A paper describes a structure:
SAP05 is an effector from a plant pathogenic phytoplasma that mediates the degradation of host transcription factors, including SPL and GATA family proteins, by hijacking the 26 S plant ubiquitin receptor RPN10 independently of substrate ubiquitination. Specifically, SAP05 folds into a tight globular structure consisting of a parallel five-stranded β-sheet (β1-β5). Although SAP05 carries a single domain, it utilizes two opposing surfaces (hereafter referred to as Lobe1 and Lobe2) to interact simultaneously with TFs and AtRPN10, forming a dumbbell-shaped structure, in which TFs and AtRPN10 have no direct surface contacts. In summary, SAP05 bridges the TFs mainly through electrostatic interactions with a hydrophobic core, whereas the SAP05-AtRPN10 interface comprises predominantly extensive hydrophobic contacts.
In addition to SPL5, SAP05 can also target plant SPL13, another member of the SPL family that plays an important role in the juvenile-to-adult vegetative transition and the vegetative-to-reproductive transition.
Author numbering:
A (entry chain B): 99 to 162
B (entry chain D): 98 to 162
C (entry chain C): 32 to 135
D (entry chain A): 37 to 135
Write the structure that this text describes.
Amino acid sequence: PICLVDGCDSDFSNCREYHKRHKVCDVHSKTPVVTINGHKQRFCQQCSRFHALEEFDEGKRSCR
Amino acid sequence: MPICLVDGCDSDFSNCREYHKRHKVCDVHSKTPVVTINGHKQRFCQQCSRFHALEEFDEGKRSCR
Amino acid sequence: GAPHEERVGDMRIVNITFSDINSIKNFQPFSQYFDFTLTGPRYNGNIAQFAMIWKIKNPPHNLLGVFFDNNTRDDEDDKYTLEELKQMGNGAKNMYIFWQYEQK
Amino acid sequence: ERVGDMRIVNITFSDINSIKNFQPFSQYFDFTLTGPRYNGNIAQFAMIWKIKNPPHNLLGVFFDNNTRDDEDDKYTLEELKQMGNGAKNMYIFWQYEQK
Ligand SMILES: [Zn+2]
Ligand SMILES: [Zn+2]
Ligand SMILES: [Zn+2]
Ligand SMILES: [Zn+2]
């Protein structure tokens, strides 16, 4: 439906059900740093959920 | 209707499959080298799943030439 | 055929997998050769409706049947294993082997 | 058949609709997508990444564990066989044909 990222300007026209179901657009699913409610997060590839940026080491796509 | 065309065959089709019912031959007579249908000598051709006269088969063959 | 498919001479071996035997009842054009009243996987000695009736010997537990698409072969219960049947196409160009899916 | 500790499992189906009764595969497929896809992770509808230059009758690729680079039209089927990244099984789904 919508992306949880602050002020995200994405229509889910060019996104797959995977993205829609996990509330993240295609761009922000890989963006290394995004903000949700003002807090730095990253969309974990392993979990398919956002976590606080502190749960990741440097550039890792997935949490530690 | 399970039937065997072979003269005198009173098979109950106990050992027979749908294949045998559909082709009007019991399991025994589907393989017998020589059977009689209405007094005529025949063999149940494996390739065709039909009876033919014996002259359509070569020496001891399950299927017509 | 697919890149991984085994061949014996000129006969392609096609392994098709199903959720269970009842899915094959809807699989045209092969369902017409099965005999769904029978227990244990069968192979066909010839081409005809319901022709898959001969009991495969010592079959793998998830094997559901074997269909040769042409020609004839010896037609007996509990005589030939699956591996031996792969040598008995006798001119068939495709040997379809039907399997029940299983995880391990 | 095997790359490292990963088994390559080719599975051939009667039709694509049949996959819907296969678990665990059905939850990872997205039947609205055109062209065979692979998953970069484990999640509902995760098989979304377009396999590059796919062979005739390939329906999809499912890696049963771990994560991998996740991009459209970048990796061929042969390249994906090197990308298990710890998965124990790579399932390759095919549409049967009569030759
Ligand atoms: Zn977004
Ligand atoms: Zn995570
Ligand atoms: Zn009889
Ligand atoms: Zn004949």
